[PDB]
Design brief:
Distance between the termini of chain A: 75 Å
Radius of gyration of chain A: 24 Å
Protein name (chain B): Immunoglobulin J chain
Strand order of the largest sheet of chain B: 1-2-3
Subcellular location (chain B): Secreted
Disulfide bonds (chain B): 10-93, 69-89, 101-126
Largest sheet of chain B: 3 strands, antiparallel
Order of helices and strands of chain B: EEEEHEEEE
Helix content of chain A: under 10%
Glycosylation sites (chain B): 46
Bound molecules: a molecule of 2 linked components (NAG-NAG), 2-acetamido-2-deoxy-beta-D-glucopyranose, calcium ion
Helix content of chain B: under 10%
Strand content of chain B: 25-35%
Distance between the termini of chain B: 35 Å
Order of helices and strands of chain A: HEEEEEEEEEHEEEEEEHEEE
Number of helices of chain A: 3
Organism (chain B): Homo sapiens (Human)
Structural class of chain A: mainly beta
Strand content of chain A: 25-35%
Oligomer: part of a larger assembly
Largest sheet of chain A: 5 strands, antiparallel
Number of strands of chain B: 8
């Protein structure tokens, strides 16, 4: 059973914390039963969702526990007590919010695609560089001209430790777009979702004219400077 | 002695005036006008819309900067009355203002919720 | 031409464009009402090109050492057609008409917010 804790994206956007314990590489076994428990004798809510059998001679199942937010930041060692007779181990996998991490805000920089890629004319690549977040749970989401993009057009990397700050983690979100889309404006906005952020959301934008441009078309008009000023 | 003529923090123009005490005779003292204008090279046309195109033309009507459309009080013999200080008025905002925090709302989707959350276009402005 | 004589300075309040005839013009310096012997205001006479709109003057005769040091002389004018009923124009040497504009259009990439 994989131990997947619900990230901050679930508890912020979905307004609900679904404690999932997904079984992996389970050879097919009838009557799969999943329950949910705490470190102590109290039991959090058992699973209500079940999944159909996988066609590759395997069985799929996803547990759930619609616990509140404030006891998700309690920090107790919640365990998914999977009732199984084929395996005598209950597979009580532990997932909780770690209290020891001290919050740090992620700053997003939007690197425009390099000229060595735009000259190749195949496809531009804008990357959102999310650096310096300690809770290791960033939800980097990508839009286009104010309209959100598909979740498969961009790949957000797993968070990795920063080179200099050891307690801060960084992520790399990369979006591949066609080359004529970048040269026709169409401002791409990278938005992140994170705990240490003030409004939980930070947005940066680039386009052809913003990110590392080869032209600055500034036309200052200081009109009426000899006319009236108190 | 740089008296602050305007301190417009929305177009970043600062105009200051002084009498340079240049010579002994009190007439040729030059009335010096210090227009200091910060041009944001990367701010968009609409600052509150971060998806707006890049602001290229920066027009600064200096009479529009120097208007004083806050009525002031004057003390008459029998009355105190609000007094208009200009005939001009009856806002592009090339730059953000430090005191004012600007928020834009983004569509954030996870499972099709589209929870519209406000960002902070200027961080460290309302924190 | 008048300040070169270094004797007196005449500041003119050009109240023009008022079609009701009666107008009240008083000068103040630093928020205190100046004496009525300091300034003399004309009777309203019709504006030439305008049909029935009037114009009026107010000549404040101050010494030149007051005006060249940069003292604010405010023209308080009261009329019925004004929205707040009183307009205050102020003039002094520092506002004036400048004789040396020094402009600095600092085109900075990382301006963003003003400071
Ligand atoms: C600048 O951008 C802001 C934010 O996108 C615009 O404000 C919105 O305008 C739409 C359409 O007028 C309204 O439906 C929203 O209610 C507005 N939101 C807010 C928070 O004001 C604003 O109109 C834009 N201004 C210009 C001149 O383009
Ligand atoms: C530069 O700005 C002027 C301002 O009117 C505009 O007409 C022109 O098209 C602009 N050129 C580019 C390349 O942005
Ligand atoms: C105008 O000149 C003064 C020197 O008297 C200088 O200090 C000031 O910086 C100048 N104004 C601007 C806007 O640079
Ligand atoms: Ca404020």
């Amino acid at each position: 059973v994989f131990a997947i804790p619900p990230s901050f994206a679930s508890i912020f956007l979905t307004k609900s914390t679904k404690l999932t314990c997904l079984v992996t590489d389970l050879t097919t076994y009838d009557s799969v039963t999943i329950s949910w428990t705490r470190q102590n004798g109290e039991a959090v809510k058992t699973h209500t969702n079940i999944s159909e059998s996988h066609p590759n001679a395997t069985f799929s199942a996803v547990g759930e526990a619609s616990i509140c937010e404030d006891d998700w930041n309690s920090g107790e060692r919640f365990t998914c007590t999977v009732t199984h007779t084929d395996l005598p181990s209950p597979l009580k996998q532990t997932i909780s919010r770690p209290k020891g991490v001290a919050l740090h805000r992620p700053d997003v920089y939007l690197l425009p695609p390099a000229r060595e890629q735009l000259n190749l004319r195949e496809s531009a690549t804008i990357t959102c560089l999310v650096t310096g977040f300690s809770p290791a749970d960033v939800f980097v989401q990508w839009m286009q001209r104010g309209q959100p993009l598909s979740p498969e057009k961009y790949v957000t990397s797993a968070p990795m430790p920063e080179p200099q700050a050891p307690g801060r983690y960084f992520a790399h979100s990369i979006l591949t777009v066609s080359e004529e889309e970048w040269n026709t404006g169409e401002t791409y906005t990278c938005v992140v979702a994170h705990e240490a952020l003030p409004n939980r959301v930070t947005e940066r934008t680039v386009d052809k004219s913003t990110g590392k441009p080869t032209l600055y078309n500034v036309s200052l008009v200081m009109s009426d400077t000899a006319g009236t000023c108190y | 002695e740089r008296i602050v003529l305007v301190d417009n923090k929305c177009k970043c123009a600062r105009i200051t005036s002084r009498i340079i005490r240049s010579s002994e005779d009190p007439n040729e003292d030059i009335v010096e006008r210090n227009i200091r204008i910060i041009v944001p090279l990367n701010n968009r046309e609409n600052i509150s819309d971060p998806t707006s195109p890049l602001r290229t033309r920066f027009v600064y009507h200096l009479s529009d900067l120097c208007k004083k459309c806050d009525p002031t009080e004057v003390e008459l013999d029998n009355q105190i009355v609000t007094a208009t200080q200009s005939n001009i008025c009856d806002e592009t905002c090339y730059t953000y203002d430090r005191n004012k925090c600007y928020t834009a709302v983004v569509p954030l989707v996870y499972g099709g919720e589209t929870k519209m959350v406000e960002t902070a276009l200027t961080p460290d402005a309302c924190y």
